Amino acid sequence: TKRQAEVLKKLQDVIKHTDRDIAAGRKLAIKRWVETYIEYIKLFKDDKLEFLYNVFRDEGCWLGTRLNNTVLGQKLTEEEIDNPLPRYGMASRYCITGKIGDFDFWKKYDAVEGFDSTVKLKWSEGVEYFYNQLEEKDKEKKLTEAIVALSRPQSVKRDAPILDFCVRNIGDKDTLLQKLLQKDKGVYFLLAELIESCFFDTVHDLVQCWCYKGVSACSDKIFSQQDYELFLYSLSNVMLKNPELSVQARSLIMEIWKCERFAEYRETSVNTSNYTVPIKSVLGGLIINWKREDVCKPDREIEKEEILDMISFAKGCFPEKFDLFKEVMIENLRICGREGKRKGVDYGKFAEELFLQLEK
Numbered sequence: 001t002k003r004q005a006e007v008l009k010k011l012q013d014v015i016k017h018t019d020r021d022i023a024a025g026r027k028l029a030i031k032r033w034v035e036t037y038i039e040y041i042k043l044f045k046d047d048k049l050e051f052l053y054n055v056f057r058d059e060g061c062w063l064g065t066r067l068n069n070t071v072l073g074q075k076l077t078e079e080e081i082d083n084p085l086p087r088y089g090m091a092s093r094y095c096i097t098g099k100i101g102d103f104d105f106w107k108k109y110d111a112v113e114g115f116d117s118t119v120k121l122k123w124s125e126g127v128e129y130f131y132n133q134l135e136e137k138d139k140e141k142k143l144t145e146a147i148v149a150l151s152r153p154q155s156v157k158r159d160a161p162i163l164d165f166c167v168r169n170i171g172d173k174d175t176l177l178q179k180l181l182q183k184d185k186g187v188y189f190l191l192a193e194l195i196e197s198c199f200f201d202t203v204h205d206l207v208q209c210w211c212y213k214g215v216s217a218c219s220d221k222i223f224s225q226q227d228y229e230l231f232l233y234s235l236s237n238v239m240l241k242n243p244e245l246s247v248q249a250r251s252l253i254m255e256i257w258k259c260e261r262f263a264e265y266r267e268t269s270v271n272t273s274n275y276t277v278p279i280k281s282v283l284g285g286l287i288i289n290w291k292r293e294d295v296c297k298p299d300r301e302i303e304k305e306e307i308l309d310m311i312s313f314a315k316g317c318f319p320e321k322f323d324l325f326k327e328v329m330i331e332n333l334r335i336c337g338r339e340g341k342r343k344g345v346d347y348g349k350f351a352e353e354l355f356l357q358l359e360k
Contacts (some may be wrong), residue, residue, distance in 0.1 A: 005048075007041060008034050014053055018289060025065025028198055030056070032161060033067065036124075037093075040085055041064050048084040053217050065201070066164075069094060069125050076335055077101060095129035114139065122158040128165060143170055151189040152181065160197035163190060167202050173209045177222065188227040200248040207252070211259050212308040221261065228265045229278050232257055236285030240340040243295050250289075253282065254306065264327055270314040272321045279312050280332050287333065288341050291350055304354075326355050 011030050017023040026191075034041070041052075055061055056076040061068055073094030077087045086100035097106065107128070111133040118126030127146070134142060143166045150159045150166075167190075167252070170176050180186040187210075194203050210222055232253055239249035257266055269278040290303040297303075315322045333347040341347065 004034075004038060004042065007038075007044065009072060010046075010049060011052060011056065014057055020244060021248060022065055024242070025198070026062065028242075029065060029067055032197075035157075036309050040089060046085065047081075051081040051083055051085075054080065057139060067165075069128060073125070079310070094125050107225065111135070112142065115142050115146075119162065122156070122162065124158075124161045124165065127162055131165075133170065140170065140172065140175075142214075144176055147176065147190060148179060148183055148186060151183070151186050151193065153185075153189065155189065155193060160193045163193055164197075164199045164202050167194075167206065170192065173206065177210050181219075181222070185227065187222055187232070191231060192234055195231070195238060195252075198238060198242060198245055200252060202243065203252060204248075204255070207255055207259075211261055212255075214303060217261065221265070223262070223265075225265050225268060228256065228262055229269060230284045232269075236282045237338075239289055240285055240338055243289070243292060243297075243340060248299075250286070250306070253286075255265075257282075257310075266313075267317050270317050270325070272318065272325045275324070275328060277314075277325060277328055279310070279314070280329060283307065284333050284336055284347075285338070286310070286337075286339060287347065287350060287354075291342075291347065293342065294340075294342050308354060311354060315358070326351070 008031060011034060012027040015023050015026045015030065017026065038108060055072065058075070061075060073096050076083065076085060076090040076094065077096065077099065079087060083090075086101070091099065091101040092104060092106045095106065097236050100106075105117075105121075109130075111130050114130035115127060115134060118130055131139065131143070147163060147166050147170075167173075167176075177187065180190060191203055191206065194200075194206075210217075235249050235253050235256075239246045239253070242249070256262070257269070259266075271277065286303065286307050290300060290307060310334045314325050318325070330348040330351050333351055336347070
């Protein structure tokens with residue numbers, strides 16, 4: 001495990017891109033990659049790890065924050081330094097049927113069967129190949145089916161990369177929303193799974209089409225109060241877990257929270273009752289992220305403003321309950337014990353300070 005962990009860090013410290021977010025996205029992609037192929041690389045040494053460097057420092061392999069599997073597979077089949085990885089193991093894993101490594105699943109399969117089987121196997125490189133071999137008519141239907149199947153409660157992290165791929169290849173996200181709404185909380189599970197794996201871009205696209213595109217939405221709210229509140233709580237946890245992607249997580253928090261379609265939900269989230277308020281984790285999450293000192297963070301002022309405006313919004317909706325709101329938040333920040341929180345510092349004081357500024 002220590003060895004496995006070392007492997008992960010070394011492979012991530014080579015990625016460098018001008019945009020911090022793109023890089024961080026890639027460090028995550030590498031993590032996911034290493035998760036899939038850990039056994040192959042388990043026993044390894046630095047010298048053998050340089051082959052993984054020339055293919056990972058090559059921007060050809062990278063398509064945005066994600067990896068171009070086709071290119072990557074080709075690079076994983078060339079025996080400069082030796083491929084310590086087996087060509088056959090990799091070729092099969094990357095569905096390179098032709099140019100089979102030669103000297104498991106991989107026979108010959110029709111497209112639909114392969115698609116339906118690869119998804120069951122949670123084989124991200126498998127679903128992609130078959131998607132290509134699919135008839136154009138059948139494409140959207142097959143993808144939609146996969147999404148519905150994989151947007152399920154008892155899910156796993158592997159499902160998210162496939163879900164990401166399916167959403168990005170859906171050419172009509174309006175019908176997708178509709179086929180998802182038939183499933184119980186099928187829309188929540190799709191967004192929550194993409195959030196946990198930090199596929200923020202995909203979520204933004206979905207939020208823009210499903211919440212911001214039109215005056216119309218048969219329930220006007222695609223999400224419920226619970227799903228709305230859970231989205232924000234889950235986003236605040238990921239933001240504290242991935243401080244380099246906090247800008248993208250903060251923008252998603254604001255877009256969901258301040259959406260006009262969910263304005264009633266926004267007012268309910270700041271209603272303090274029974275010594276609790278649903279925005280506690282989220283408002284506490286932004287405060288902790290704003291006071292982080294282990295990262296060089298530009299625009300801490302913008303972050304402070306969001307916090308202040310969220311506090312001001314709570315005062316404007318229920319002015320009578322504001323002192324209750326202040327006491328609940330201060331007490332929550334003193335016992336929270338969440339990630340990114342510096343131990344031994346009283347975060348309650350920071351809140352008290354924000355409350356005073358508001359008074360003036």
